[PDB]
Design a protein around this ligand. Sequence first.
Ligand code: NA
Length: 827
Amino acid sequence: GPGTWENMAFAQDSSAINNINGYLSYTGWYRPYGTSQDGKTWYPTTVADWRPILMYVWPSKDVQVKFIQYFVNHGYENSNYGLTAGSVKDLSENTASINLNEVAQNLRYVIEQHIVAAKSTSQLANDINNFITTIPELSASSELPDESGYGQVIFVNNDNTSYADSKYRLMSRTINNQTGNDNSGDNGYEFLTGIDIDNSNPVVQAENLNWEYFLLNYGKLMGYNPDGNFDGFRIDAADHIDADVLDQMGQLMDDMYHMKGNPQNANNHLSYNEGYRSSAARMLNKKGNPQLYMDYVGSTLGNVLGRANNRDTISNLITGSIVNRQNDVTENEATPNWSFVTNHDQRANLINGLIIKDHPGAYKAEYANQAWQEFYADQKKTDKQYAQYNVPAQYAILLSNKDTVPQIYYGDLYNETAQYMQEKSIYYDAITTLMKARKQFVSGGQTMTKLSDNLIASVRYGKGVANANSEGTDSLSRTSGMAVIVGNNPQMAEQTISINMGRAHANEQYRNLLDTTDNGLTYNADGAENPETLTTDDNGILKVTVKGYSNPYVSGYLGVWVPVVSVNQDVTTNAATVSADSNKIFESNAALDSHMIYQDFSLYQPEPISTENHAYNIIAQNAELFNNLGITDFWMAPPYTQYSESRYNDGYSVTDRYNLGTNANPTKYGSGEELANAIAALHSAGLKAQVDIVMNQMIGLPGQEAVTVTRADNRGMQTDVNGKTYANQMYFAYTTGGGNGQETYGGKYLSELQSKYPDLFTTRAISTGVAPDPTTHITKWSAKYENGTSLQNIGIGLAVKLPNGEYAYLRSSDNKSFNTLLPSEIS
Ligand code: NA
């Protein structure tokens, strides 16, 4: 017959009870055998009638009382069941168990009334979520965020979560701590954000090689445009992943394209690593430079020229880089690097900050339109507060700098929040003019001479001219080279300066390529203090008039002088097929200097309002434009499928590593078909394409897994957050996903890789002393292949523990470790 025995779960399996690897949650729901609204009549539940576990079971009698008090005070009161503000206000943990259970049961009758009345379990679900916030232990605050609202947990071994155990999880094995013999050193930390991937696990190291091979043959393998294949990689968070994968990538690329011997093969398959840690340059040089080091001159440029106040001296442009350019007259000595003006987190770190100013640390509703309108408005002004000063001047330095592959930002050529390449920025004309000038003029040795604290003269001596004294070996020697004068003081006094152009440029006329005026810059010398053409003296000295200007384009001075010519000229050095050093992959020389990278995306790039607006489609239309500007290499956005609730949909919140978009379901950039056509369009114009490869993290994995966690710092060592900490805690983290792409293409090309390139899976990795393992294919990511996750806003108190101290467990289909053990109220 009927009774309170029907609070029992219909059956004790996954069919009737919510569980994550057999373990119950207070957020979790279950199907009781029967429910009741009065206490007299009990109706046997159907498989449509589920109820939350927090109605029946609680962590402690304190929370049982607080659950009763909250619900009653939030419109679940009924004096016909002795439930009113007053009747439940005096109850505490010291109240009798036999008493509280009567009140909790009487409340459970009143909740069943609301479910019928409201005709759903939606307000109940809403009220449970709101109650959990009031209880500090069940709340999302229990996982201990730091003062900045950030943090991370590490996945550790445990008897309860033995499936999620790992022999590896070698954390912060980065740069020069690959061996783990300087954990406290200059290595770079493991955790950034999202679910951190364990790149120390040999199976994951094999999956990375599979993933690289897929991208290097994307067009052919997917049956799209067969020339739609990536030639290299932009390596995301290279300083925050086991450096074994940087070695293994270098091995694969050398095996496939034979780059070690031939600089031409090397340069045609360009790879560059995100991370400016000086230890990275040291590490890469020692290995023979498998990838290009990220230079920090972009930070120097923003400090010297970029700021409104507090501008660092002009001499920092000489020394504030991995390469010293006081008198750089040598080749194959400088660290092979890739530099820029606009840092890759710069726009984000400015726009974010402009939000928390407008709305002070308030809930993040998308008023980024406001922040961007403020940015665009500020950008046009002379007296800027937010946007960079001297943007043209910063690029003039970058594009004239020897021993670097310069990288242009899409957002500096175009308004990056407008539809892709619809609106040019005010700095388009300036930067594009300097870009074309680079291909024609910029070559030979470099000398950056300080004329004052605020003024500098960066001179290039032209192709086949080693230094100031050189005659000139090449036939373009005489009619190539450049002088880039940059003042960072807008109240600098009018004065005449002397610039040593070199012995090869004695009694030679020089065109006024670019000069400053009251309004901005002039390309025909109109408005400037210097005429269209000046001639050098007998010793090759140029007399230039300079003064301090203050306009939207220049806060100081900018002047560029190139030799007078009759013809189109191209000072690109062709790479040899026999290297000076056979130990090296990449060498900082005229051949590598001839290259120029282009970041083809912004984070704040908008969703396309049609197929024509797809970035891939527009890139394919303007392949020859990029070629005209002198762009050789194309850094393409991470083209992977994204977390639907990601802020930007930028590509770094990767949900499927092999799904690059379909005709019906494209990314923000477009479909895989369009990507392949975009890559082929660039290839057609003699350009190469590098893919943004995100081996560090994955974000938005929909499958939850019961994992054991410890609150750790961003290196993976346990940390104490304002006195509090926790280790060996149950955590229902989102660990499991990958999509059909990881399922379909997961370790599917390892057979082919092992047949053609056996050395890949025999070569012992430094961090493990063990080769990558291709015997297991990763078709679905889980905790076992992960170091940890950034705090997921869930809490550490959800795991249901019985009065005896043991976790509540179910012996489900796959869940079969220990014996079934449910709370008293659910059996
Ligand atoms: Na990492």
